[PDB]
Design a protein around this ligand. Structure first.
Ligand SMILES: *[C@@H]1O[C@H](CO)[C@@H](O)[C@H](O[C@H]2O[C@H](CO)[C@H](O)[C@H](O)[C@H]2O)[C@H]1NC(C)=O
Ligand SMILES: *[C@@H]1O[C@H](CO)[C@@H](O)[C@H](O[C@H]2O[C@H](CO)[C@H](O)[C@H](O)[C@H]2O)[C@H]1NC(C)=O
Ligand code: PT
Ligand code: PT
Lengths: 158, 158
């Protein structure tokens, strides 16, 4: 009459799952900031356009000509995507999202490579003047381990 | 779409089972030498009788008047129970039995407390003369951790 054998199969499948569990914990989180990155890249046409037609970065959602509140640029895991002086910043929600990335953010910004702009992707940045952004890391930025290698740009990237 | 939650329940039930598994491993083994002890205590009436009617310990199964081969005193986990000079020794099988106790043994022997005998239970012993046994530990004796506290007698017990 065999509990033991069953207790061995439960035991080996349950440590395998505990072993897997971190990897899938980190897989999901990368798929959840993947959307934030996509919601923010949607906004680059408008920003690029706005800067090209005028010489000035759009001050907000409404200048660039995208939905006036950021909360309307929201997804399954992103709460809001926001243009603030040509820098678009996506904030993760705090529901349906992994704890180490809930409520955190990344940013896309561009530099003029005179004739067009050059875009970058990375952790939050604030525009200081028409060609320089500065790190805006306040402790709510997506950790580097969850950012793709494409979106690892530092404030001074060129 | 939730693998994670399931992976957490599998993970917690599987470490609990790995935690339990030693205890139940040791539970079973105590229930398996429990039978060896019972198969050997069955044989004490005959041995006690034989010594009382004569002054000599029975030399074998056939003198004491129990089944001439020990292999016929066998159970679910015991292979054979054997009278050899008044000492009855039970050997565990090597199938249906836990590895740390498979093939190992214990022994019951008595001393004359003149008028009757006094019995003891413990790890194997060999009779040296009509009143002394000696430890017969050859490396095939049941470990102390699996012997009940009732069956912890040392060779020189009185
Ligand atoms: C759109 O982005 C421009 C970047 O250079 C801003 O000037 C612009 O603000 C100006 O236009 C609005 C129009 O209502 C207001 O008059 C502001 O006071 C102006 O500075 C900005 N538009 C918005 C709605 O902020
Ligand atoms: C039964 O136990 C006795 C203990 O004192 C032994 O002597 C006895 O052996 C003797 O009797 C048998 C009978 O067949 C043989 O004759 C032996 O040679 C005797 O020593 C023992 N009986 C057995 C079967 O060993
Ligand atoms: Pt304009
Ligand atoms: Pt006799």
């Amino acid at each position: 009459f065999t509990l033991i054998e069953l207790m061995i199969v439960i035991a080996i499948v349950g440590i395998l799952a505990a072993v897997a569990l971190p990897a899938y914990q980190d897989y999901t989180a990368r798929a959840q900031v993947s959307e934030a990155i996509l919601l923010a890249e949607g906004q680059k046409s408008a920003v690029t356009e706005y800067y090209l037609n005028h010489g000035k970065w759009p001050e907000n959602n409404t200048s660039a000509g995208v939905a006036s509140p950021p909360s309307d640029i929201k997804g399954k895991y992103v709460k809001e995507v926001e243009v603030k002086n040509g820098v678009v910043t996506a904030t993760m929600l705090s529901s349906g999202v992994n704890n180490e990335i809930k409520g955190k953010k990344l940013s896309l910004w561009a530099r003029r490579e005179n004739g067009s702009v050059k875009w970058f992707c990375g952790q939050p940045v604030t525009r200081t003047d028409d060609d320089t952004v500065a790190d805006a890391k306040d402790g709510k930025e997506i950790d580097t381990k969850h950012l793709p290698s494409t979106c690892r740009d530092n404030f001074d990237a060129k």
